[PDB]
Amino acid sequence: DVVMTQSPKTISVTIGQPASISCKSSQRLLNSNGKTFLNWLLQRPGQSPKRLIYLGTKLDSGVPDRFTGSGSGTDFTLKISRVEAEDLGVYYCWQGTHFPYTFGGGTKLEIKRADAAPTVSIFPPSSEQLTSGGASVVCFLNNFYPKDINVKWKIDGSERQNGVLNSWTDQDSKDSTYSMSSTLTLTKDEYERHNSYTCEATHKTSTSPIVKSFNRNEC
Template identity: 55%
Template structure:
């Protein structure tokens, strides 16, 4: 009869919301942009994302309607193959930023920051190429075209 109690104890280690879960806060929640202008999105973690191996597992994804999320940046600042140079990532510890130097129409969509340092597990050998499954909503920023105001 000890086995079920041990199993229950093991399962409790993986319950979301338990002590130690990292909370990500992304700002702004929506960002009206002008084509050709710069844009930036911030992501703040409730605790440091620096892993004991020296890496910081912070990634940025872009999701467009009807498509799966696309990995743009991994390990804070490393662009994935095929991602335009206008995208850059920076930050350390708990504060991170995604910058777009000149917004293009194809950049419109929902952006996600994602951490893999604490939970869920990550792969040291190869960064994730798909948005991993999570049990809580991810912070997002919806980037869309803003209205242009003209003065007469």
């Protein structure tokens, strides 16, 4: 099967700057009638892949003319003349000249922006959940940049590492930031035994962590 190799794996680009990414195929993609079945696609966060370029060099239907495909034979390039935040996502190449048809592994376009500290919010277990046996404490770390961040949980000032589950959003095209949710799950009985709960976020916008806490049984 034809191997489609994309590089780089990821690219970070400031809004208004160009981008270029490469797709190299293990066999030539020209066919016996002069057509090159090479497409580029973009998959935006939470969407299906969508058309961009086809026939190697042709803009597909309705696609912004900021996208240009070039190349022939085995070596293809996608250029964006000036990046917009909504261009972020994973760009794929695809070949339809040689059965079975194959896709590249994807190049992720990230938008570079100014640093932003997270907004940190902590939430106690709901009364409804406490009637059930379990107790989840949730911390949101929202709208930060760059994407690396660390969260630490404390119960009555002591670090708790077990029972924590984290989840991360993809980059937002509206403000080019990232967000994270961390949930600490305990039994209802262990939660009701302790008093203070703390979420600490460490990020490069500040030298000391951002700390949000509550006491159980206080509003």
